[PDB]
Design a protein around this ligand. Structure first.
Ligand code: MG
Ligand code: MG
Ligand code: MG
Lengths: 287, 67, 55, 68, 132, 95
């Protein structure tokens, strides 16, 4: 624009002409002068001028406020409670529209992470993502998605458009590998197995109404229909759909990645995969 | 495809069919007083709460028994 | 019979009225409600269902 | 003048000297040997069979799994 | 005999896992606006003196901001050309709503415009009409 | 408190605060009432009801409690089934 024309007229830019942005630096004040010297802002002789006032929270000898209030367990066990990041249907629809997630293929945590759709902190006790009903009315996509937790209304929205949603469990060690797979391959170790849910979480993941990954497949057809009746839509049949194979794809309950089995080694340097030939090893991984 | 002792086939042997879960349940048109959607007319008004209205002609409607 | 009068001969849809009381009075909201119970936050909310913002 | 060559990271697998007293200990573990294969594939020279657990290690892994 | 067998066929799944470094360009849609609400810039470009560019995420750069805990503002950021012309248009567009001329700041060095009060939704719709 | 620790050079949390108060992400703090388990036989029915409640803290108390805890206790927590999910935010507040 016109600004660059000004440069042509003005003298050369050099190390003798530099200037900071105005107001970017304040002035630091030393106690030399009369305004800021003498008593130097500390007051008259006492404990505070000399520099030895009591600590924060001390009230002069009466029992302090933060210790006269009774103890109660608001934060008991906080470091052991499980955490799930929320993913709303507004956010999911937004991501598909801009092309940062590919709806043709199945969607799992790895694909969500790779598109910056979600940020996962395993060291802060994140165990995965839960689908949230907000934005359900305007969801107009057909997809295959796997999440750790789901809500009643969120499941309805996905399926009404002819899609599949399922709930799956990952352990702390597996979750770290899932989010950042490439650094694991650089280590040179075999892929580990996936542990089953703790005892308390077994009822949730073996229940059809939750779309669990360990529930009886025979009972799914009944559950899907009842949602259609309750929320007033017609249950579509996906077997007719051309993409039935994609929508039906599901991984083994002891598998982390779709096309890879426990016990394999990924040699990324020369694009090869190594498999063990020992019966004891094969039996261990397959169990 | 990899399979393990905990694969759904082994855990639930009877329902080994590939499409057992995605089949539309047969019948049930008489289940829980199935309300035919086509008969009803549904309109959404943005009245905050987004109101919904359902209207149908009582006498003409035949799914409900006359008495 | 009033429904019939509005329909048959007046030939218009009948209106329905309801008795509405004025909204309850609450003092102005404070950033720090000292020595007030947890319920204080409920008095000033409009919707009862959770929201998730950018997430 | 002419500037000197740009600094470059040394390429290729790294095998520290075991006898030297001042070599850091962490570089002498089996984990470090495994990393070399992961970064550099076959050029490392690490016997691929070593990556998997040995039979004595396998028994310990299985024993712990049953316990917990 | 070695204990490992090497296969090259299954590496395709590994290739899927690789993450990208560049933001993908949005995909073409038959019907706009897109279900979420996104709408691409119109073609041909507007002929106004000032041009407003989009962010790396392909959104209109209008932001809500606050300071001191009680001062509410809105910001239009990536302006090229004559920033002063844009100020005149914004004052005319917003003046009837407020009942007074809005208070604004113009930063020529950073090419941004700052307005007192929250007017992000109206400005976003206003800019789309002009087709930036 | 410890402004600069020997081993890490960081501030330290006062753990007697963490055992007595709850912090909502907006900046409010919750507590109980002193004496809510003591000599209940000599307290009236209205007095006992007041004691059972959860109560908020003043501005000066909130300021002091913030200095005595580190940032980790001030983050966003996404607990499934949280019973305080609806109290972490403010609505219709002009201030
Ligand atoms: Mg100084
Ligand atoms: Mg986080
Ligand atoms: Mg008091």
């Amino acid at each position: 624009g016109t600004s660059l024309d000004l440069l042509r007229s003005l003298p050369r830019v050099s190390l003798a002409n530099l200037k900071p942005s105005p107001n970017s630096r304040k002035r630091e004040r030393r106690p030399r002068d009369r305004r800021r010297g003498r008593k130097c802002g500390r007051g008259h002789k006492g404990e505070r001028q000399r520099g030895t006032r009591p600590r924060l929270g001390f009230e002069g000898g009466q029992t302090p406020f933060y210790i006269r209030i009774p103890k109660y367990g608001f934060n008991e066990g906080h470091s052991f409670r499980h955490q799930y990041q929320p993913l709303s249907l507004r956010r999911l629809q937004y991501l598909i529209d801009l092309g940062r997630v590919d709806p043709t293929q199945p969607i799992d945590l790895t694909q969500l992470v790779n598109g910056r759709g979600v940020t996962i902190q395993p060291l802060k006790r994140d165990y995965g993502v839960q689908l949230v009903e907000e934005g359900a009315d305007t969801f107009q996509a057909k997809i295959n998605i796997e999440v750790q937790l789901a809500s009643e209304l969120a499941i309805a929205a996905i399926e009404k458009n002819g899609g599949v949603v399922t709930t799956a469990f990952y352990d702390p060690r597996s979750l770290e590998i899932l989010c950042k797979p490439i650094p694991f391959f650089l280590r040179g170790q075999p892929i580990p197995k996936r542990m089953l849910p703790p005892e308390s979480l077994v009822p949730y993941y073996t229940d059809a109404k939750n779309r669990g990954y360990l529930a009886d497949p025979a009972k799914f057809p009944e559950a899907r229909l009842e949602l259609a009746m309750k929320f007033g839509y017609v249950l579509p049949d996906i077997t007719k759909d051309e993409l039935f194979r994609m929508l039906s794809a599901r991984k083994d309950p002891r598998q982390i990645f779709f096309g890879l089995a426990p016990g394999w080694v990924v040699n990324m340097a020369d694009k090869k995969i190594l498999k063990p030939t020992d019966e004891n090893l094969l039996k261990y991984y397959s169990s | 495809t990899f399979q393990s002792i905990y694969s759904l086939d082994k855990l639930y042997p009877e329902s080994k069919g590939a499409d057992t879960a995605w089949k539309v349940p047969e019948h049930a048109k008489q289940a829980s007083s199935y309300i035919p959607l086509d008969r009803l007319s549904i309109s959404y008004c943005r009245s905050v709460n987004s109101k919904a209205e359902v209207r149908f002609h009582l006498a003409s409607a035949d799914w409900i028994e006359e008495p | 019979s009033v429904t019939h009068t509005f329909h048959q001969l007046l030939d218009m849809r009948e209106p329905v009225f309801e008795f509405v009381r004025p909204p309850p009075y609450h003092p102005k909201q404070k950033r720090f409600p000292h020595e007030q119970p947890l319920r204080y936050l409920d008095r000033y909310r409009d919707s009862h269902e959770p929201t998730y913002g950018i997430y | 003048y002419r500037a000197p060559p740009p600094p470059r990271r040394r390429p290729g697998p790294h095998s520290p000297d075991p006898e030297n007293l001042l070599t850091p200990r962490w570089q002498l573990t089996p984990r470090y040997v495994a990393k070399q294969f992961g970064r550099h594939g076959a050029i490392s020279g690490v016997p691929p069979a070593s990556l998997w657990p040995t039979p004595e290690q396998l028994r310990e892994l299985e024993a712990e799994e049953q316990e917990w | 005999n070695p204990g490992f067998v090497e296969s090259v066929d299954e590496y395709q799944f590994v290739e899927r896992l690789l993450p990208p470094t560049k933001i993908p360009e949005p995909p073409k849609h038959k019907h706009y606006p897109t279900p979420s609400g996104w709408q691409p810039p119109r073609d041909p470009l507007p002929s106004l003196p000032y041009f407003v560019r989009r962010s790396r995420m392909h959104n209109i750069p209008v932001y809500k901001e606050i300071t001191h805990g009680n001062r509410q503002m809105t910001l239009i950021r990536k302006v090229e050309g004559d920033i002063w012309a844009l100020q005149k248009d914004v004052e005319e567009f917003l003046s009837p709503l407020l009942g007074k001329t809005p208070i604004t700041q113009v930063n020529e060095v950073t090419g941004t415009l700052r307005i007192k009060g929250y007017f992000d939704e109206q400005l976003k719709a206003w800019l789309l009409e002009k087709g930036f | 408190l410890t402004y600069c620790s020997t081993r890490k050079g960081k501030r330290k949390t006062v753990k007697s605060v963490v055992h007595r108060f709850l912090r909502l992400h907006s900046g409010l703090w919750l507590r109980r009432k002193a004496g809510y388990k003591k000599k209940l036989w000599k307290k009236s029915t209205a007095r006992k009801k007041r004691l059972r409640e959860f109560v908020f803290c003043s501005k000066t108390q909130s300021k002091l409690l913030d200095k005595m805890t580190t940032s980790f206790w001030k983050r966003r927590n996404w607990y499934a089934g949280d019973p305080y999910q609806m109290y972490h935010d403010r609505t219709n507040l002009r201030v």
